[PDB]
UniProtKB/Swiss-Prot annotation:
Subcellular location: Cell membrane
Protein name: Apelin receptor
Consequence when changing residue 35 to A: Decreased APLN/apelin-13 potency. Decreased G(i) and beta-arresting signalings after APLN/apelin-13 induction
Tissues and organs where the protein is expressed, per its UniProt entry: Expressed in heart, brain, kidney, stomach, spleen, thymus, lung, ovary, small intestine and colon, adipose tissues and pancreas. Expressed in glial cells, astrocytes and neuronal subpopulations. Expressed in embryonic (ESCs) and induced (iPSCs) pluripotent stem cells.
Protein family membership: Belongs to the G-protein coupled receptor 1 family.
Ranges in a coiled coil: none
Documented effect of changing residue 19 to A: Decreased APLN/apelin-13 potency
Function of the protein: G protein-coupled receptor for peptide hormones apelin (APLN) and apelin receptor early endogenous ligand (APELA/ELA), that plays a role in the regulation of normal cardiovascular function and fluid homeostasis. When acting as apelin receptor, activates both G(i) protein pathway that inhibits adenylate cyclase activity, and the beta-arrestin pathway that promotes internalization of the receptor. APLNR/APJ also functions as mechanoreceptor that is activated by pathological stimuli in a G-protein-independent fashion to induce beta-arrestin signaling, hence eliciting cardiac hypertrophy. (Microbial infection) Alternative coreceptor with CD4 for HIV-1 infection; may be involved in the development of AIDS dementia.
Quaternary assembly: Homodimer; dimerization inhibits APLNR-mediated G protein and beta-arrestin signaling pathways compared to monomeric APLNR.
Length: 64
């Protein structure tokens, strides 16, 4: 029974929107996980097999 008569435009309704109830969900108690399961599957995967082969080549970085 939230009075307010007509014209009731709710107001300050943002008090129930993505503002400070989802971003602060954790921050320091949730990232250490997703960043732990994506650490061995977001870099260790590959992105390297090329680097190593980048110092070899066996030419001159050219192929015109």
């Amino acid at each position: 029974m939230e009075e307010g008569g007509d014209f009731d435009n709710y107001y300050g309704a943002d008090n129930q929107s993505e503002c400070e109830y989802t971003d602060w969900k954790s921050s320091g108690a949730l990232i250490p996980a997703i960043y732990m399961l994506v650490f061995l599957l977001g870099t260790t995967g590959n992105g390297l097999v090329l680097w190593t082969v980048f110092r070899k080549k066996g030419h001159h970085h050219h192929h015109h």
